[PDB]
C-alpha cells in the first residue's frame, strides 16, 4: 500500500468516504452473504475454522464508532470478509463467487476513495 494509506490518520472527512464505500458494498446484489455474521447453524465448523470472522454489519458498527485509525485497518477488515469466505468454501460455491465479484467492486471503490483523499 502507498504511504498515505498506511500512515495518514483518518479524519472525519475520510469517514464520510468510508461510509459511502461501505454503503455501496451493502447495496450490491452480490453482497447478500456478507451483510451479517455467518450463522453457525448454517456452517457447523465455521467458527472453529475461521479465527477472525468479519461481516459488513460489524464494519458498519466500527465505522460509526470511529474504530479505524488508518485506511490500512479498514481495508484489512474488508479483506477478511473475502479471505475467510474463500478459505472456508470451495471455488464453485455461490459464496466464493460472491467474494470474487464483491472484492473486485470493493477494489474499484477503494481506488476511487484513495484518489479523492487529496481533494
Residue count, binding to ligand 7WE (CB under 6 A): 12
Among 5, 28, 30, 46, binds ligand 7WE (CB under 6 A): 46
Return phi, psi of residue 26, to 5°.
-60, -30
Q: What are residue 68's phi and psi, to 5 degrees?
A: -80, 135
Interface with ligand 7WE (CB under 6 A), residue from 95, 97, 113, 114: 95
92 binding ligand 7WE? (CB under 6 A) = no
Instruction: Report the alpha-carbon distance of residue 16 to residue 94 in Å, rounded.
Output: 31
C-alpha cell at 74: 479498514
- The residues of the shown chain that bind ligand 7WE, judged by CB under 6 A, are 33-34, 36, 38-39, 42-43, 46, 85, 88-89, 95
Amino acid at each position: 500500500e502507498d504511504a498515505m494509506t498506511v500512515l495518514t490518520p483518518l479524519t472525519e472527512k475520510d469517514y464520510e468516504g468510508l461510509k459511502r464505500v461501505l454503503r455501496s458494498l451493502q447495496a450490491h446484489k452480490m453482497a447478500w452473504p456478507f451483510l451479517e455474521p455467518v450463522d453457525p447453524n448454517d456452517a457447523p465448523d465455521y467458527y472453529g475454522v475461521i479465527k477472525e470472522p468479519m461481516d459488513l454489519a460489524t464494519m458498519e458498527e466500527r465505522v460509526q464508532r470511529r474504530y479505524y485509525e488508518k485506511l490500512t485497518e479498514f481495508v484489512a477488515d474488508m479483506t477478511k470478509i473475502f479471505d475467510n469466505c474463500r478459505y472456508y468454501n470451495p471455488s464453485d460455491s455461490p459464496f466464493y463467487q460472491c467474494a470474487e465479484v464483491l472484492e473486485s467492486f470493493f477494489v474499484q471503490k477503494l481506488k476511487g476513495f484513495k484518489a479523492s483523499r487529496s481533494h
